[PDB]
């Protein structure tokens, strides 16, 4: 059985997610339009920048995240942002289409679209294999939200100072996830480990994305298409 405090963490994490993920995607029409040279860089840059703002909002509602120092909050966000985005993107991913479908056909992104934004198959191949395998996990909403929160509260990121506090936050969330799966997820004896595995894949996806981001950011004709928030969060400055 789950404790009162464990389920509260669940509630406040589900709420935080529902506040920061708009299943209507009606905000996308505000981005620079897609073009299908790097024709998709403007739109996808806006897609990513928008998503960073959502991830910061989710983070701010994780229990304890706001009590960290701002430095740790920034450190945790600069290192984990691209991972939370890949995780949260599973909600629009479709096995049918092997793509991310966000309402209309102009907001459907396949692999070929993402290449027109400066990323290669050495990133897109493992990413799409990650998305299908994660989609197959058939995660409950409670589990999806816990994994995002656990990924964000990882103490083994470059730059975190108060390691001990962050590890403890993350430990609590894991205990909540282990208990939740046990009590509430039938046939989920091996699910916790499969989820922890996905965190490991995320780190490899992160590295590859960072590699390719650098070549984008070192070319001013491309980096100028990015947003101020993207350049700051993915930039290599330290506090």
């Amino acid at each position: 059985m789950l404790s009162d405090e464990q389920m509260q963490i669940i509630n406040s994490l589900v709420e935080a997610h529902h506040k920061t993920y708009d299943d209507s995607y009606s905000d996308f029409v505000r981005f620079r339009p897609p073009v299908r040279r790097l024709s998709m860089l403007p739109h996808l840059a806006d897609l990513v920048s928008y998503s960073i703002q959502k991830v910061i909002g989710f983070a701010k509602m994780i229990p304890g995240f706001r009590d960290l120092t701002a430095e740790d909050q920034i450190a945790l966000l600069k290192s984990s942002a691209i991972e939370i985005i890949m995780l949260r993107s599973n909600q629009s991913f479709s096995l049918e289409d092997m793509s991310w479908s966000c309402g209309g056909p102009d907001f459907k992104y396949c692999i070929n679209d993402v290449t027109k934004a400066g990323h290669t198959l050495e990133l897109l191949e493992p990413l799409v294999k990650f998305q299908v395998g994660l989609k197959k996990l058939k995660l409950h909403e409670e589990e999806h939200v816990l994994l995002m929160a656990i990924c964000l509260l990882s103490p083994d990121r470059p730059g975190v100072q108060d390691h001990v506090r962050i590890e403890a936050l993350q430990d609590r969330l894991c205990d909540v996830l282990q208990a939740y799966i046990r009590i509430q997820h039938p046939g989920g004896r091996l699910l916790y480990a499969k989820m922890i595995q996905k965190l490991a894949d995320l780190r490899s996806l992160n590295e590859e994305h960072s590699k390719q981001y650098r070549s984008l950011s070192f070319q001013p004709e491309h980096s100028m298409q990015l947003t101020p928030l993207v350049l700051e969060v993915f930039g290599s400055e330290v506090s």
Binding site: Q53, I56, K60, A70, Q73, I74, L77, K78, P228, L229, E232, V233, E237, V238, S239
Partner: peptide, 10 residues
């Protein structure tokens, strides 16, 4: 050093 981030974090 992280202007926008600090603002976004209230």
């Amino acid at each position: 050093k992280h202007k926008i981030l600090h603002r976004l974090l209230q």
